[PDB]
Amino acid sequence: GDFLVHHAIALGLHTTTLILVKGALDARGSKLMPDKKDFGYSFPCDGPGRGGTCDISAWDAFYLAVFWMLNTIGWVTFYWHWKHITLWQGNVSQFNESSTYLMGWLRDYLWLNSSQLINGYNPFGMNSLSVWAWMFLFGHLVWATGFMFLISWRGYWQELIETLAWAHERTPLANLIRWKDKPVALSIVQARLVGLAHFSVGYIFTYAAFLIASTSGKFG
Amino acid sequence: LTTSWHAQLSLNLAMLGSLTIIVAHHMYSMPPYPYLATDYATQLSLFTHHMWIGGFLIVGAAAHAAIFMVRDYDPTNRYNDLLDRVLRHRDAIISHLNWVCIFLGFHSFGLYIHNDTMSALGRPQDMFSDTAIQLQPVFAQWIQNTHALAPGVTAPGETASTSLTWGGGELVAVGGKVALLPIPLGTADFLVHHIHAFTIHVTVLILLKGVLFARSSRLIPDKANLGFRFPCDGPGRGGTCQVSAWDHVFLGLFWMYNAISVVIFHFSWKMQSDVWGSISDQGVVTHITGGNFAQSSITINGWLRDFLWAQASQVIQSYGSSLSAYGLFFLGAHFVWAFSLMFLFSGRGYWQELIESIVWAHNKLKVAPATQPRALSIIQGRAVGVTHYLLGGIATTWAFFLARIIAV
Amino acid sequence: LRFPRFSQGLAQDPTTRRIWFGIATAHDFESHDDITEERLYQNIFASHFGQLAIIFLWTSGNLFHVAWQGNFETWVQDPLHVRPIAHAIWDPHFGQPAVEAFTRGGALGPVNIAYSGVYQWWYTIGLRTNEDLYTGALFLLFLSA
Amino acid sequence: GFTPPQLDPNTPSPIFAGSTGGLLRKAQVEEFYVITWNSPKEQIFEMPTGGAAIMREGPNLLKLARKEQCLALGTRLRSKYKITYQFYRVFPNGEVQYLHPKDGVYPEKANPGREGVGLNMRSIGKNVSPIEVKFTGKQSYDL
Amino acid sequence: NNLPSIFVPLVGLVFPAIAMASLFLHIQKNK
Amino acid sequence: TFQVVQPINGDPFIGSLETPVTSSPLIAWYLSNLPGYRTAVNPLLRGVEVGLAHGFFLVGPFVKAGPLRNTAYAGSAGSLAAAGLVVILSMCLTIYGISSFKEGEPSIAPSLTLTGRKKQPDQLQTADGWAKFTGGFFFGGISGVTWAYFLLYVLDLPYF
Amino acid sequence: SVYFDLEDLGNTTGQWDVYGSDAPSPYNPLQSKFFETFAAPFTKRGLLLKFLILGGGSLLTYVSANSTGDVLPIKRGPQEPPKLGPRGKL
Amino acid sequence: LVDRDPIKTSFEEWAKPGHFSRTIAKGPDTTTWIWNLHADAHDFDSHTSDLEEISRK
Amino acid sequence: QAALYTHHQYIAGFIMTGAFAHGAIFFIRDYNPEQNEDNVLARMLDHKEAIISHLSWASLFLGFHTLGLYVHND
Amino acid sequence: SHSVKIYDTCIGCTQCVRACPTDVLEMIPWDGCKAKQIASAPRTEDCVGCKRCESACPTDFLSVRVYLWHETTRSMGLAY
Ligand code: CLA
Ligand code: CLA
Ligand code: CLA
Ligand code: CLA
Ligand code: CLA
Ligand code: CLA
Ligand SMILES: CC1=C(/C=C/C(C)=C/C=C/C(C)=C/C=C/C=C(C)/C=C/C=C(C)/C=C/C2=C(C)CCCC2(C)C)C(C)(C)CCC1
Ligand code: SF4
């Protein structure tokens, strides 16, 4: 199992390095955009011509590499935590036998060790683990929220916003109040950053709550 | 309607989807086949299957309505007054639908977060529940009471009520199992029904906004010239990503998936907790989950714990038995669903630039094909992402449902 | 001119994009109007000083809270049977069961159990009483100033 | 050798029943646009703001909110009905600015007397590196 | 002690309001 | 054929429509008599009326839904919370008035009626008018909250 | 059918007051005089903001500091003996 | 209201992929041609503008 | 122990990403081709394709075989 | 306002001016190509940045380039 997880870690490291190096070396231009250095480090695109140029800047290359770094660190921390939990409980054989297949991971690490976490508050009462369960759900919410910015793009939202201005301007007793800055949807680059921030915050909070609660419920 | 094939297709698809949903709702409460009510797996499978089919057909209706709007609309020779009047006040319709969606989302999902916070803080007496603050569905209970008293008063020719779920009080047991019995309605049903309404309203908003603004808008006056399926109109005007009518269907498929998943989860938990069970010689009913739906479904933590965590032990422990195929499909669908996020979160330029390096080494060894490799288009990438997402999610739910219901 | 002061192009934006982009480009001294190399270096130096001050203030706050609301003195005697205390809790939203459940250790009210390992680190390097932590916090406040 | 035509405020407007896609407070506070054309017969056309309208035979006048809308309408007119058109920009104080075709000759046809703006007498690959213009207010292009 | 009954509301309700009002006035200013 | 919906003021190229909801004589009379549409009256009196009306309203939800709703301190806590909300709203109004209006400038309200008749612009759209409106709103809100509390928990009226 | 005019841009751009009314004041002169007399000090936007901040800060802080445990459960404190943690820890 | 033998039954069109479209039938310069072949397979309205032929298909 | 390990490893990952980000920023903004003619810095931009392709090969090989073995065991 | 530039690799086929959704581009006489024409950008203050001109350039790399720049009420396509 250590062999398999070490090779998975190596795969993650190699893929992240590949993404970052490809982003760094093609920063001054390529065959698709020979004059990329004249447009700066961060810019949305070069239009839909020549087949489409979505995420053509080095900033998007960095933006795509954060997911892989998070995945690799998650694998490393999962391995460390499961191995040390099995060592501390005095049942090291469970990790030796159950770590060679992925269903073993899903059943004997996540499902098994999350019983005390999800019982922080129940229809019968609460105990000191309530805050960790609340943070678990909060992290799930933020991580899911990031998907809205990551999947849906700008043109849908500007059209929706354009109608709300009309609704406000045509409503009695409310058109007496007017804005100073014209509302617009978030820019192309901004939404990627917002989605990435939501993703990372949810990831960190959820794993921290699970790890801390699962260790402290058993070993204090 | 006698010259355009797309409008007829849209109308027929909408009607067929609605009929499929009606059939799915009617089949479970009025079992038409012998020994079908006591076969729980068959009932669950048929319900979920027909609901998914109806949802897909409903989405296709809006898609083809948008196609007709883009292509076959011609006021010069095919003028219609009703269609003209609708297009002249679309802003009010969209704004009102937006307000309704926001209000429903605030006043339906917000009550769940309130219950979670009060439960976490240690104040069970300040929650929206049957014991602290009741939100009773008094209108539906009145309908149940009226239908339970229908025979002999308003239906003299009938001997019994149409369904046993109206609340007659009689229970039918076949082979030691409970076939059907009255279904109570409480505070949780109120919340879940309003959640259903919120999700349906959001999906309708997305699809109708896509259909109505298919030809033009204040942002792109000439949107009809670009066609029904185009990716964008450049980075100008701040950004014009996904302005076509195709992108609105692409976006509404996700919401259809969300709504149908919530509905099927509600059905499964409610039937397992309040209807299905076993009867003994003395006539005491023991349900599958012990009737915990009333007090546990009022919080998100309850849904995560008593439904997702508790009922998934059947599929994760199916290895080494005849049900291991469902256990394999669980992880396979997990992988397929997770694999779709690569196409949805990324763009074409990176993959086109990466291919250039791969082609270079093939040229070095004289293995470069004459059919030049090109990265997928934007529309193709979005379609692949949505297809893999839907397939993974539906396969996961299918495997979980079958593995849970076959064993117990 | 108006906010942002360092960007003429952003200050003339009539939309809400002025605020969002004004926040996100504050520390990119290279793209500011009328910038020179010397001003860039001086700004970097000042920013480094500010970062050091913030770090010292954070450490001083940690020490002060551990001294004021912790259980360091009783943890020293029995390190293996005492749970370290990070700080106290004063939440008006709490219910009575929440007050009962979070009252752990030797505390007289709700508290948080520390998991940063500051207790063992401070005990190893020779700190034994609450008077030492107060002096350390005062010295760190002086360093930040 | 070309004087812009004057705008006639008495030109009638096409037959329209009204919509929610018309002018807003920006027209009151900032500029708006007016497009005029001459039609040989009464016919139905598609409004850029949604719906359908019937244009009158003879002079026609129409107010719009953007230059894109009036240019799209003019392009549709020239492509389908073979109609000549001009449009203007009108400011809140009362000044009218003539915009198109700006010469009496459409942009796609070369006309003597036009000045060249934004011409770089080199290839796109001869732009200098960003390091060579550092700490200055200029860019790699327009240099 | 009684200090948390003062500093917690002072930091969580008063100072955020003052800061938000001042920042809104500053970002809405023009010359 | 008779038609009901008409373009706004006869101009079909303005982004609005005339419907029975907007142009009914009853609705037109009702809206013109609200304190926010009396453009020829002192803004202080309109602000006082608006403050009284809104302050009387806010007591009920706080009183009946608050955490102390099932104790002997329900009314006092609800009234105090309503007063705090009124104070916050007054702060918001003051901030909006400071940020939006500048001293010495004329009013920005329209000076034309629907029938084309010229009229004096509303003075509410100036700094002094908005300040008077905000002060009147604060006074009226506090007075209305006090009146509601007095009626509910000083006089034993048979409510509910 | 002329909707464009250069000498009158108020009607051209639709600068109308739809619901504004020019009717005189309907309130009693005595009541109005009382309200202007007693509500006058709050009409200065410079002083009103500072007064609101100071009053909100002083009133909210005073109530919280002198609160009794019968209202706030956290002011009452724990009322039960503590329970030992895992591995026999306090 | 029927037509006798409108279209001959032959295998000729089987050996020429993309016969329904003029652009696709040119040839696979890049790999986008293969994807475009399948996406426009059943869009009868794009193939021809005759309503009778679309109805017959 | 687990909290300290996870904290430090996540911080190290973020810092490692930032290093490459600022390297790309340097290449875009501060690189001068004339002053760096045919040195070690300039010769890596010459054969970037080989580095990228070899990294792709290594990643594909590792992922293919690791996933294959895991699925076979499952 | 955005910046639009023209380079002397122009062949003067008038494809960019026809695809312009506003009135930004135009053609002027020139010498240096067979068509004896070259494009121009006298009205960049009306530029919105949709980059339709670059979608119509037949030259290997573009003889017309659009650089996004400071945004105004015209370049954002707002009709509020
Ligand atoms: C879990 C993630 C998530 C969440 C929360 C939402 C939420 C929402 N989406 Mg959405 N979406 C998501 C993922 C998500 N989406 C994904 C993955 C996609 C695919 C790309 C979409 C695609 C999508 C479309 C296409 C549309 C939406 C729309 C909406 C909104 C519906 C109207 C509304 O106001 O609802 C009510 C809002 C909520 C329930 C969220 C609030 C949660 C509670 C109430 C928090 C309240 C806190 C309170 C205010 C105090 C805060 C103070 C602070 C100091 C703490 C809502 C905000 C629609 C929209 O714009 O509005 C109509 C719309 O058209 N979404
Ligand atoms: C009676 C039902 C019906 C009918 C007759 C049509 C007919 C049509 N639709 Mg359509 N549609 C329907 C229902 C229907 N639709 C529904 C319910 C939806 C909502 C999901 C849609 C959504 C939709 C969109 C979004 C579009 C159409 C389009 C079209 C037209 C072109 C079809 C085409 O080229 O597809 C070609 C068919 C394929 C490429 C096959 C798709 C393969 C599926 C998705 C994957 C299956 C996965 C499978 C299990 C894995 C096994 C793979 C195997 C190789 C191993 C055609 C007129 C298009 C159109 O009109 O464009 C102008 C278009 O863009 N439809
Ligand atoms: C016979 C054809 C052929 C040959 C000789 C190569 C050779 C090579 N490829 Mg490759 N490749 C091919 C087809 C081929 N490829 C096809 C069809 C694809 C698309 C799926 C790829 C996708 C691909 C990627 C993504 C990468 C390579 C890479 C490489 C190099 C690393 C060695 C290796 O095993 O990579 C691994 C090779 C594969 C994963 C290819 C999969 C095997 C395919 C499916 C075999 C198909 C053969 C084809 C049907 C021939 C038909 C013959 C028939 C007419 C008689 C090597 C020079 C790597 C490299 O160094 O970058 C330049 C790299 O990263 N290839
Ligand atoms: C929409 C969802 C929702 C709803 C309805 C409520 C409702 C409530 N919450 Mg709550 N809460 C929510 C979400 C929600 N919460 C979320 C998401 C959180 C987590 C952030 C919390 C956290 C929370 C806490 C921590 C506490 C509450 C408490 C309360 C109760 C007291 C509220 C109060 O003082 O009055 C607020 C209401 C008003 C001031 C006025 C409302 C008047 C409405 C808007 C009517 C106006 C519309 C009208 C019909 C328009 C007419 C048209 C016109 C022409 C006439 C109340 C029952 C407290 C409690 O003790 O509960 C028992 C409490 O301590 N909540
Ligand atoms: C982080 C800081 C913070 C603090 C200290 C508090 C403190 C409090 N919240 Mg709270 N809250 C916060 C953040 C905070 N909240 C956030 C971020 C949210 C959004 C998620 C909420 C949402 C929330 C709800 C929904 C409710 C509370 C309630 C309460 C009160 C508990 C019940 C009580 O004692 O009734 C006793 C209350 C009184 C006796 C009257 C109110 C207290 C003062 C005297 C009112 C006047 C203060 C001042 C004059 C006006 C503001 C001044 C301005 C400068 C701030 C308590 C004062 C509950 C409550 O009762 O609120 C009224 C309630 O229902 N909060
Ligand atoms: C669980 C989701 C998932 C998966 C499986 C992958 C997998 C992969 N990513 Mg990736 N990625 C993901 C999410 C995912 N990503 C996300 C969320 C992001 C952020 C947007 C990225 C961003 C990203 C970047 C930036 C890059 C990758 C790359 C890669 C590839 C290199 C790794 C490798 O060794 O290939 C292992 C190969 C596999 C796992 C493929 C398995 C092949 C099976 C056998 C297919 C079988 C087909 C079917 C069964 C037969 C026909 C049936 C019919 C129904 C179809 C790999 C295919 C890199 C790449 O493509 O270049 C090398 C790259 O540069 N990814
Ligand atoms: C003695 C000894 C030993 C040794 C070891 C060693 C020797 C190691 C090494 C190690 C190493 C050797 C490492 C390394 C690393 C590296 C890295 C980590 C890198 C990075 C990079 C980067 C980040 C880059 C950046 C950039 C770019 C991209 C561009 C521009 C420029 C720059 C630079 C900025 C052993 C243990 C065996 C045993 C015991 C004893
Ligand atoms: S970017 Fe768009 S608006 Fe600007 S010149 Fe090119 S086509 Fe015209």
Are B382 and B343 a contacting pair, CB within 8 Å?
yes
CA–CA dist C3, C18 (Å, integer): 8
CA–CA dist B238, B243 (Å, integer): 13
Point out which residues pair with A126 in neighbouring strands.
A121
Per the document, the length of chain A is: 220
CA distances from B260 to A49, B140, B196, G32, J55 (A): 38, 22, 9, 61, 42
Please measure the distance between the N-terminal and C-terminal CA atoms of chain E and give it in whole angstroms: 49
CA–CA dist B204, B198 (Å, integer): 10
**Can you tell me which residue has the tokens 């049903």?**
B189
Q: Name which of D124, A41, B241 is nearest J57 in CA terms.
A: D124
F62's CB contacts (< 8 A; 6+ apart) are F77, F78, F79, F81, F82, F85
Q: Helix B90-121 crosses helix A154-169 at what angle (to 10 degrees)?
A: 100
CA dihedral B388, B390, B395, B401 (to 10 degrees): 160
Are A159 and A16 a contacting pair, CB within 8 Å?
no
To what resolution in angstroms was this structure determined?
A: 3.2
Are B37 and B174 a contacting pair, CB within 8 Å?
yes
Given phi > 0 = left and psi -120 to 50 = alpha, else beta, which region is D94?
left
On the CB side of J22, CA atoms within 13 Å amount to 23
What count of other Cβ atoms lies within 10 Å of the Cβ of residue I26? 12
Question: Are J72 and C12 an interchain contact pair (Cβ–Cβ within 8 Å)?
Answer: yes
Q: Is A140 annotated as a binding residue?
A: yes
Q: Is F14 on the interface with B (CB under 8 A)?
A: no
Experimental technique for the deposited model: cryo-EM
Point out which residues pair with D60 in neighbouring strands.
D37
Q: Name which of A195, A219, A218 is nearest A64 in CA terms.
A: A195
On the CB side of B242, CA atoms within 13 Å amount to 24
CA–CA dist B174, B157 (Å, integer): 27
CA–CA dist A19, A64 (Å, integer): 8
**Can you tell me which residue has the tokens 């990119």?**
C28
Specify the 3-state DSSP secondary structure of D113. coil
**Can you tell me which residue has the tokens 């959704």?**
J21
Q: Name which of B271, D56, G85, D141 is nearest A218 in CA terms.
A: G85
Q: Is J16 annotated as a binding residue?
A: yes
CA–CA dist B321, B328 (Å, integer): 12
Token couple for I31 = 């690189």
Token couple for I70 = 């895991």
What count of other Cβ atoms lies within 10 Å of the Cβ of residue D26? 18
**Cα angle: C83, vertex C85, C91; to 5 degrees:** 130
Are B267 and B165 a contacting pair, CB within 8 Å?
no
Specify the 3-state DSSP secondary structure of H46. helix
Question: Are C105 and G72 an interchain contact pair (Cβ–Cβ within 8 Å)?
Answer: no
Greatest C-alpha distance within chain I = 57
CA distances from F152 to F52, F54, F78, F85 (A): 16, 16, 11, 19
**Can you tell me which residue has the tokens 């703001």?**
D49
On the CB side of D84, CA atoms within 13 Å amount to 4
Q: How far from chain centre, in Å, is Cα A62?
A: 14
Are J77 and B219 a contacting pair, CB within 8 Å?
yes
Selected residues 114-133 of chain A with any CB under 8 Å from a CB in chain I: none
CA–CA dist F62, F57 (Å, integer): 10
For CA atoms F137, F139, F140, F143, the dihedral sign is positive
Q: Name which of A182, D52, A153, D82 is nearest B216 in CA terms.
A: D52
CA–CA dist F108, F99 (Å, integer): 15
DSSP annotation of F116: S
Are I17 and A65 a contacting pair, CB within 8 Å?
yes
**Breaks in chain I after residues (C–N exceeding 2.5 Å):** none
Taking one residue from D and the other from J, the number of pairs with CB-CB distance under 8 angstroms is 99
Q: Name which of B36, E15, F22, D133 is nearest I29 in CA terms.
A: D133
Amino acid of residue B279: I
CA–CA dist J55, J49 (Å, integer): 12
Closest chain G C-alpha to E23 CA, distance in angstroms: 15
CA distances from I45 to A15, D128, I22, I28, I42 (A): 20, 18, 17, 13, 6
Name the strand (E) or helix (H) holding D39.
Answer: strand D32-39
Q: Is A45 annotated as a binding residue?
A: yes
CA–CA dist A191, G26 (Å, integer): 53
Whether the bond into D130 is cis, omega within 30 of 0 = no
CA–CA dist J35, B154 (Å, integer): 89
For CA atoms C59, C65, C68, C69, the dihedral sign is negative
Q: Helix F74-100 crosses helix E15-27 at what angle (to 10 degrees)?
A: 20
Selected residues 32-91 of chain F with any CB under 8 Å from a CB in chain B: 67
Three-state SS string across A138-197, please?
A: HHHHHHHHHHHHHHCCHHHHHHHHHHHHHHHHCCCCCCCCCCCCECCCCCHHHHHHHHHH
- Mutation site, C7, C13, C20, interface J, largest J CB count within 10 A: C13
Q: Name which of J41, J40, J66 is nearest J52 in CA terms.
A: J66
Amino acid of residue E8: V
CA–CA dist D14, D49 (Å, integer): 14
**Breaks in chain G after residues (C–N exceeding 2.5 Å):** none
Name the pairing type of β-strands D119-120 and J3-7.
Answer: parallel
Q: Where are the alpha helices (DSSP H) in D8-57?
A: 25-29
Are A102 and B331 a contacting pair, CB within 8 Å?
yes
Are F90 and F83 a contacting pair, CB within 8 Å?
no
Q: Is J10 annotated as a binding residue?
A: yes
DSSP annotation of D7: P
Do J and I have ≥3 inter-chain CB pairs under 8 A?
no
CA–CA dist B247, B265 (Å, integer): 28
Are A214 and A116 a contacting pair, CB within 8 Å?
yes
Do E and J have ≥3 inter-chain CB pairs under 8 A?
no
**Cα angle: B64, vertex B70, B71; to 5 degrees:** 90
Three-state SS string across C55-109, please?
A: HHHHHHHHHHHHHHHCCHHHHHHCHHHCCCEEEECCCCCCCHHHHHHCCCCCCCC
Cβ(B111) to ligand 4 under 6 A? yes
Name the strand (E) or helix (H) holding B116.
Answer: helix B90-121
Identify the chains in contact with G, defined as 3+ C-beta pairs within 8 A. Answer: A, C, D, E, F
CA–CA dist A8, A6 (Å, integer): 5
C20's CB contacts (< 8 A; 6+ apart) are A186, A187, A190
Q: Name which of E12, J53, I74, D69 is nearest C93 in CA terms.
A: E12
CA–CA dist G10, F110 (Å, integer): 9
Cβ(B117) to ligand 4 under 6 A? yes
CA–CA dist C115, C84 (Å, integer): 8
Whether the bond into B221 is cis, omega within 30 of 0 = no
Are D89 and D99 a contacting pair, CB within 8 Å?
yes
Q: Name which of C35, C25, C128, C33 is nearest C79 in CA terms.
A: C128
Q: How far from chain centre, in Å, is Cα C62?
A: 8
Q: Name which of J73, J16, J22, J64 is nearest J46 in CA terms.
A: J22
Q: Where are the alpha helices (DSSP H) in B230-377?
A: 245-274, 293-296, 300-302, 310-311, 313-316, 324-339, 341-345, 348-364
Find the residues whose C-beta lies inside 6 A of ligand 2: B 56-57, 59-60, 63, 67, 228-229, 246, 249, 387; H 38-43
C136's CB contacts (< 8 A; 6+ apart) are C60, C63, C127
Token couple for A138 = 């909060």
Residue in chain E lying closest to C22 (CA): E27
Are B320 and B312 a contacting pair, CB within 8 Å?
no
E7's CB contacts (< 8 A; 6+ apart) are none
CA–CA dist G43, F135 (Å, integer): 5
CA–CA dist J73, D66 (Å, integer): 11
Task: Write the residue with the smallest CA distance to atom 9 of ligand 4.
Answer: B114
Q: Helix C130-144 crosses helix C37-69 at what angle (to 10 degrees)?
A: 160
For CA atoms B251, B252, B256, B259, the dihedral sign is positive
A188's CB contacts (< 8 A; 6+ apart) are A44, A45, A153, A154, B235, B239, B241
Residue A172 has its nearest CB partner, among F31, F99, F124, at F31
Q: Name which of A86, H53, F88, A82 is nearest G60 in CA terms.
A: F88
F128's CB contacts (< 8 A; 6+ apart) are none
CA–CA dist F112, B217 (Å, integer): 31
Kindly write down the DSSP assignment for every residue of J4-66, as one continuous string.
EEEETT-----HHHHT-SSS--EEEE-SSSSS-EEEE-S-GGG-----TTTTS--SSS-SEEE
Token couple for I51 = 């580095």
Closest chain B C-alpha to H27 CA, distance in angstroms: 10
Please measure the distance between the N-terminal and C-terminal CA atoms of chain H and give it in whole angstroms: 16
DSSP annotation of J71: -
Q: Helix B378-407 crosses helix B245-274 at what angle (to 10 degrees)?
A: 10
Cβ(A145) to ligand 1 under 6 A? yes
Which ligand gives the minimal distance to the CA of J43? 8
CA–CA dist B111, B191 (Å, integer): 8
